[PDB]
Design a protein around this nucleic acid. Structure first.
Lengths: 77, 59, 187, 110, 141
RNA sequence: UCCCCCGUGCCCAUAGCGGCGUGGAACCACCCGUUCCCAUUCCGAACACGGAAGUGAAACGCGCCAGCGCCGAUGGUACUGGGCGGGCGACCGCCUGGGAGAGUAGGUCGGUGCGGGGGA
RNA sequence: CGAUCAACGGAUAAAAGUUACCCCGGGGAUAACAGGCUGAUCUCCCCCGAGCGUCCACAGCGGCGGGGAGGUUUGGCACCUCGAUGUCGGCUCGUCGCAUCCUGGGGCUGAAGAAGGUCCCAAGGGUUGGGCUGUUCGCCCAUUAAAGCGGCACGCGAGCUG
RNA sequence: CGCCUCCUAAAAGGUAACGGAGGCGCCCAAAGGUCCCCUCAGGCGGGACGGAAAUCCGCCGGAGAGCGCAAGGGUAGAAGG
RNA sequence: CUGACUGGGGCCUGUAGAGCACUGAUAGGGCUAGGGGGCCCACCAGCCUACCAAACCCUGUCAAACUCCGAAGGGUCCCAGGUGGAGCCUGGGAGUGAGGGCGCGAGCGAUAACGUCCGCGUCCGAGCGCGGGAACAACCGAGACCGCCAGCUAAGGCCCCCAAGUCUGGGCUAAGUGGUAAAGGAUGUGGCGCCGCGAAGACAGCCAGGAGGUGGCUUAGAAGCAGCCAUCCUUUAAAGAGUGCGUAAUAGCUCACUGGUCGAGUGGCGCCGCGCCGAAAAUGAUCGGGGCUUAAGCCCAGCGCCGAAGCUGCGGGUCUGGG
């Protein structure tokens, strides 16, 4: 008896890193995601790999706009 | 309101969170009583280990 | 027919107690009202088999109210096939939807030949008058053979009836019977 | 359901909403050109120019120039200088480009 | 016998069986049925044995209604092999059946025939069962 | 300060789909031409300019309709945190807190801000 | 820039087998024996009764399936034991279970009698000799009332043989 | 035997088994940037060759298409042409 | 003061569940392409098909790698509580890196293993210190500083061993079940609910009769006891051209049925509690034993009592922190 299966890639540690109502400095990774489960918004940047991060400082503000996808905002202090 | 709280059952073998809840109320031995102000936080810890402890609202 | 059943307002009693107490927790409502209630288990069963959803059921409230109602739905203990909560639809005025039984007059010629008859929908869906509820709907299921089928469009209706399903919805079919003769192939 | 008109409109306007500078929306009817400054954070029209209101005439390009300078004046009176131009569904050309020149030369920054 | 003609995944995990029958728990098609009473699996050989038993006891007419299906691939390893080194092969296809599951609906049959037929089929199956009738409880569901 | 229209936006279908009627004062649109600006992997279809012959047919706008769609209770339950038990086992009960999805009733043929033009 | 330094955090720039001729250190961290837990497999037992059985489901049978018991097989795990628990077979000596081969008792019969079949209760006693093979096992030989099946570390090497 | 995808994996992440499935060991000078333009699959009806399926037309379609290649995530208010 | 933990609030998640909106799988129908059959058939089409069979629709289900949804929860952060052998930082020293059992959620396995592999938790390890469970590391109780010829309780017990009730009240069981196992079976028993007929008299015990042509498909010549094609009524209690013994022939029996004699329950269902069988393994058996039956079992209600190294009381020691 042999096996074709048995291999699995490494855990990537995706997900949201800072939550709403949480102070962040600019440059902090907000969401480490594949594709855009959250879209960048107010004061929120997104690198080449869809990584959302703080553009300016302040507080994180998640906001779902229904059909318009889930956005993130960095509301300044 | 205040809370006469008598630890009336061993926490041994129970989950460490429950034991830590006992320490939060400062209870250390069996038969140890503590009247403590009923705060929703303290009342939360009491609710967590209510099965391990007896409670009576005194004042 | 008029099937009366005493209705009591469950106030804050735990449903497990009432179901334990021979009481069937239910709730009666319309676009106007909504009330937590309970009944007798054995009473609701006895009437309800007579008083299937096809029929008005007058809940005899404690205050003297006699509600023309309709069992919109009933919850069942799947682990026991036992009713566990009742949905009493307060059959007020302004004609409402329900299910009416089916009076399948006659026997299919094919069924007499040896085929098997299956009733697809043994009840029908109609938004009809609260006080114009025909208890039955007959059908000519005699002129059929094995493989013949009827639909919702062929059912004739009493006055004021509104078929609330697809007219092309088949409801009665005659399929080939179950025979050991076709089992030696399978033996 | 959308149109290349509509899809173009949300296209350019998403692109320009993206930056954050005030937007210069430019509707363009067959007989008129409408232009306004808008703060997407507030959904409030700051300054409103419109060929219809000015009662202009002549070549539509002409009126686009004129209303462009008019809106430039109304805005510069309010201190608004940097503003993102929104060509909307339109191609940046002809009347719309004439208006944009009406604002750039009108003292507006873009 | 009963078996899925194809599937996204050949093998499959066993999985807990606790809980009540989610779907298929009221007499829907036939007049009588054989509802389960204890959670258990039922292979295609067992479903088939109960089916042929029912049809034989009828022996004429009637309509049999199998409201279950053996999709989950049953699995055992080769005989006398040590543990590990892959997963066992697909012995066959079973069907999970929780309590409340109305396994069988027979219609187009006299009461006594369907009753005794469902009784024999009950003996063919590995679970305590209960013959029942289509009811307003069924009609209301 | 109200009605209409035109631009925007927000809420993300209760907002849609579908059918129905309706608007040309104005706006918008359709529309008239293609010399110009510009353009077609061909085409003035589109885009672009000049324009006003006619039309709201279309579109678009508004008002009606629940057929579809979407929203959706209340109860009840699944489930479950926790504390208890039971079961040979599969698994199952009970107390406390939480509590669905489905379905039912029922509801929705949008609401909202900003700025313009018109009107009252 | 030169990597299948791919055993891919890459021991050399550079490397395969064999040992019953073996040896040392360790291990019950781990195998073969046994024991142990499970009972898949196995033996046995019941459920349904399709069908057979002139007919007649059940004298005898018992399709397809189901539910059990035992723990003697082959197995699984690796739990004691690798500063040792000697492993098949035969012999001697037994003892025990009954899921009874005969002997005892009985039921039913497709039991005329006789002979049988099946089941039930029953472990007191018995269960032969030989050929072949290391064999157990099995076949055969001649019998027998019968020529039981198993446990006892597949009993028994501080009892023997090898 | 290294890395990617999914489940396993118990609604944070991480999480084992010689567990259940597939991949990678490249490729693109455009398959990169930017501006501008367009929106698919599919279904129906009509259409010479010509079809089931070429190209064309109209009609219905939120994406079920496509997005170089595994899966997934994402995506037409584009990342698609 | 930041800790564990707790409350408030904010948000993140796709699990259980549920559902079929995607992907599949899927049972039966409608519908119907299309292929299959029959003719009509090649002049090419057309009918019929109880054939298979798209797509679609209806009803009904499944999914670890499906999700229109979706918890309970958990994660994080802010605020508050929280002074603890709490927390953080900086250094020195470690050991450990063979774990195991139990519970729960999973995988593998055979929904086997005192199995293996994970997650959450606990205990042992290291607590083989203590009470109970007879004996027993992880099951129940409970964290052993010491002493006392003190007291109160935990689980567990209170008939003797063995301390505490042959304690009290209400039931059930008769199997020593208790004090071993399943399907399946069962006039076991106790309690239920459900329906029938019950004096225009029940079951029941009896008593008395109980059919005719005679033939149908007539045929292994039995109108009825035989493979069935049948089932007119008739005889003033009306009793079927039968259930079964003789009948490839009559018999005669007996039943349903006719009433009467007795004269009150009887008849049949479903539910539940506790029981029976089902139930055979190997040295001598056994609930730990003795024994135990309105229990000394099981269930329910109590009260009291016993019961540890738990706690309390006294005394003592010692460590940290404060005076």
């Amino acid at each position: 008896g042999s096996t074709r299966n048995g291999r699995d890639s490494q855990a990537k540690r995706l997900g949201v890193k800072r939550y709403e109502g949480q102070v962040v400095r600019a440059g902090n990774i907000l969401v480490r995601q594949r594709g855009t489960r959250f879209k960048p918004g107010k004061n929120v940047g997104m690198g080449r790999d869809f990584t959302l991060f703080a553009l300016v400082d302040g507080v994180v503000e998640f906001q779902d706009r229904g059909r318009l996808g889930r956005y993130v905002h960095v509301r300044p202090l | 309101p205040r809370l006469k709280v008598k630890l009336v059952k061993s926490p041994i073998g129970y989950p460490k969170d429950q034991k830590a809840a006992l320490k939060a109320l400062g209870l250390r031995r069996l038969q140890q009583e503590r009247v403590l102000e009923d705060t929703p936080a303290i009342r939360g810890n009491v609710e967590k280990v209510a099965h391990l402890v007896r409670v009576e609202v005194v004042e | 027919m008029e099937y009366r059943l005493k209705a009591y307002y469950r106030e804050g009693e735990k449903p497990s107690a009432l179901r334990r107490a021979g009481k069937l927790p239910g709730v009666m409502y319309n676009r106007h009202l909504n009330r937590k209630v309970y009944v007798d288990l054995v009473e609701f069963d006895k009437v309800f088999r007579q008083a299937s959803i096809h029929h008005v059921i007058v809940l005899e409230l404690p205050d003297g109210q006699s509600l023309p109602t309709l069992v919109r739905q009933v919850n069942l203990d799947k682990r026991r096939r036992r009713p566990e909560h009742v949905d009493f639809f307060v059959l007020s005025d302004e004609p409402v939807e329900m299910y009416v039984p089916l009076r399948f007059v006659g026997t299919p010629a094919g069924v007499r030949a040896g085929g098997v008859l299956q009733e697809i929908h043994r009840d029908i869906l109609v938004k009809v008058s609260p006080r114009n509820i025909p208890e039955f709907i007959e059908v000519d299921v005699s002129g059929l053979e094995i493989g013949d089928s009827l639909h919702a469009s062929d059912l004739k209706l009493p006055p004021g009836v509104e078929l609330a399903v697809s007219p092309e919805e088949t409801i009665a079919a005659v399929v080939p019977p179950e025979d050991v003769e076709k089992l030696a192939e399978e033996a | 359901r959308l149109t290349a008109y509509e899809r173009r409109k949300f296209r350019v306007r998403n692109r320009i909403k993206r930056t954050g500078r005030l937007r210069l929306s430019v509707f363009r009817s067959l007989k008129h050109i409408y232009a306004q400054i808008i703060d997407d954070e507030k959904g409030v029209t700051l300054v409103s120019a419109s060929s219809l209101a000015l009662k202009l005439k002549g070549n539509k390009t002409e009126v686009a120039r004129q209303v462009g300078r008019a809106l430039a004046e109304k805005a510069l009176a309010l201190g608004i200088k940097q503003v993102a131009f929104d060509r909307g569904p339109y191609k940046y050309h002809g009347r719309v480009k004439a208006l944009a020149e009406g604002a750039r030369e009108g003292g507006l920054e873009f | 016998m009963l078996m899925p003609r194809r599937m996204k995944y050949r093998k499959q995990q066993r999985g807990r069986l606790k809980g009540a029958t989610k779907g298929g728990d009221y007499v829907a098609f036939g007049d009588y049925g054989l509802v389960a009473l204890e959670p258990a699996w039922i292979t295609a050989q067992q479903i088939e044995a109960a089916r042929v038993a029912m049809v034989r006891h009828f022996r004429r007419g009637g309509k049999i209604f199998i409201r279950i299906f053996p999709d989950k691939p049953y699995t055992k390893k080769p005989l006398e092999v040590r543990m590990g080194k892959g997963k066992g092969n697909v012995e066959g296809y079973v069907a999970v059946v929780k309590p409340g599951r109305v396994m069988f609906e027979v219609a187009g049959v006299t009461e006594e025939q369907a009753m005794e037929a469902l009784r024999i089929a009950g003996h063919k199956l590995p679970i305590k069962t209960k013959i029942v009738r289509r009811d307003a409880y069924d009609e209301a569901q």
